[PDB]
Amino acid sequence: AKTVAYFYDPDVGNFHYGAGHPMKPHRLALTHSLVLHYGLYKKMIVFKPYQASQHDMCRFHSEDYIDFLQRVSPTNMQGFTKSLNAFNVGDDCPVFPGLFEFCSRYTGASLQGATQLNNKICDIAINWAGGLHHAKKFEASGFCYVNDIVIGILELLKYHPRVLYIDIDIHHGDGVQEAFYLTDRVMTVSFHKYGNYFFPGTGDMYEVGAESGRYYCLNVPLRDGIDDQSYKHLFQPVINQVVDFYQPTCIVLQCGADSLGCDRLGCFNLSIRGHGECVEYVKSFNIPLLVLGGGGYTVRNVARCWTYETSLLVEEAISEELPYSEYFEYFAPDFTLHPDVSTRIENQNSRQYLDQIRQTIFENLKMLN
Amino acid sequence: KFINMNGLMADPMKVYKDRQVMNMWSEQEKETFREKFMQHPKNFGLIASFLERKTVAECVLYYYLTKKN
Ligand SMILES: O=P(O)(O)O[C@@H]1[C@@H](OP(=O)(O)O)[C@H](OP(=O)(O)O)[C@@H](O)[C@@H](O)[C@H]1OP(=O)(O)O
Numbered sequence A: 001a002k003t004v005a006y007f008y009d010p011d012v013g014n015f016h017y018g019a020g021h022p023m024k025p026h027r028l029a030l031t032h033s034l035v036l037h038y039g040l041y042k043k044m045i046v047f048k049p050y051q052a053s054q055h056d057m058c059r060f061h062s063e064d065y066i067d068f069l070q071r072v073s074p075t076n077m078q079g080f081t082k083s084l085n086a087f088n089v090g091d092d093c094p095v096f097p098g099l100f101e102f103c104s105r106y107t108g109a110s111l112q113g114a115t116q117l118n119n120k121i122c123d124i125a126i127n128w129a130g131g132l133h134h135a136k137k138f139e140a141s142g143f144c145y146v147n148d149i150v151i152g153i154l155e156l157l158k159y160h161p162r163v164l165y166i167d168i169d170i171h172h173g174d175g176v177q178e179a180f181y182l183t184d185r186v187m188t189v190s191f192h193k194y195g196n197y198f199f200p201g202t203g204d205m206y207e208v209g210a211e212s213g214r215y216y217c218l219n220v221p222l223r224d225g226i227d228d229q230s231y232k233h234l235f236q237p238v239i240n241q242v243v244d245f246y247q248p249t250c251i252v253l254q255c256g257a258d259s260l261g262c263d264r265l266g267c268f269n270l271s272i273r274g275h276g277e278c279v280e281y282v283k284s285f286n287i288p289l290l291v292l293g294g295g296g297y298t299v300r301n302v303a304r305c306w307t308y309e310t311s312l313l314v315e316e317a318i319s320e321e322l323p324y325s326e327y328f329e330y331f332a333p334d335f336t337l338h339p340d341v342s343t344r345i346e347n348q349n350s351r352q353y354l355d356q357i358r359q360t361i362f363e364n365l366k367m368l369n
Numbered sequence B: 001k002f003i004n005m006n007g008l009m010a011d012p013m014k015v016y017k018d019r020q021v022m023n024m025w026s027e028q029e030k031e032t033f034r035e036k037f038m039q040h041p042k043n044f045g046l047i048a049s050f051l052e053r054k055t056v057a058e059c060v061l062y063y064y065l066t067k068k069n
């Protein structure tokens, strides 16, 4: 029935951010490995993806910022001290070999996905390499250099009057929210841990948009330890009413796996099944769908999450047992698709808090009829 | 035949397998990686520089293919 395009870049995983850095591009290699060994490619149109140029990128980002990303290298940094500070490169966003190639590679696939949805080449396009939602017009942020999401949504807007952006990463999708804050042509919905200066420190419930974009931006701020059932209890009602009221002609879903229990950076308690319930619910609306990756810092769990979500998107029930492959040992000791990722830590989201949250969200939603 | 002009992969498994078949590291290469690594951990830029037929991306790939085994 549904045509699913899947972008497989054999090279996009062969990068390393540096010693100590939680972002591991090779998590994309593990994901592809499992996706292929499960035979899921048989249900998808698999593309070696387009690579984005500065021309593509500068439809959103500044010319000098992108220029700097091409110019800076591990060996020439000493002469770029002021630029590193100005462009916010060097800390969360380090200089590593192949930085620009990696950006071009992940962005390109997002853009091609948008392009194929526009052309009705497919119903669902998947780029696990994309979804770097923090990057701003002229600064790097939060492990993200180029905001492939905004670039992709710009492309969708050529044909789509209304684009719904849904962000499931544990972090507030601030870069996407900023780019589109003043317009009603993209509605940004973000669920995230908020409070106690947890990065990026924004995505307060009162951030609802401005100018003609007032009420076309929605933030759901959560505390530590949210579980499947509680998350589902918010997510499904909110999204259902967003779709009804806003009537998007296209959806962009950022599927950051750092909202899983036992994530290296995250403090949520979602299972792989719970996270997949969100993806499947978005799929149920039968609206053209661009599916992106994003955060995810327990490599072994990230690869499995996105593999399982691939199988859902393709409507294929795959075995709990992982097939043997070059990365089999990464999945020790269980070697299973659905390991226990429970935090076994107390959920900080009281019923009162969630209802106080619930009531302000639906009040905001009322403004769109 | 396995990849079209426009990048459509007719046989994605064959494409993937091809990348593993090109796991052609000699013992001089293998040994240089290790010594350069323990000296400079995860400095794959530096490691690649001491390897005539290995780039920084191949070094990253080798690291992940072997760091268990
Ligand atoms: O999950 P992996 O990426 O395979 O390995 C990371 C390792 O990252 P690498 O650079 O080897 O991919 C990571 O290294 P770093 O401290 O440099 O991020 C370890 O801390 C630990 O989480 C380690 O995880 P562990 O093997 O589960 O302890």
Ligand SMILES: [K+]
Pocket: A167, A168, A169, A170, A171, A172, A173, A190, A191, A192
């Ligand atoms: K989010």
Ligand SMILES: [K+]
Pocket: A180, A181, A182, A183, A184, A185, A186, A187, A188, A209, A213, A216, A217
């Ligand atoms: K907006």
Ligand SMILES: [Zn+2]
Pocket: A169, A170, A171, A256, A258, A294, A295, A296
């Ligand atoms: Zn995140």
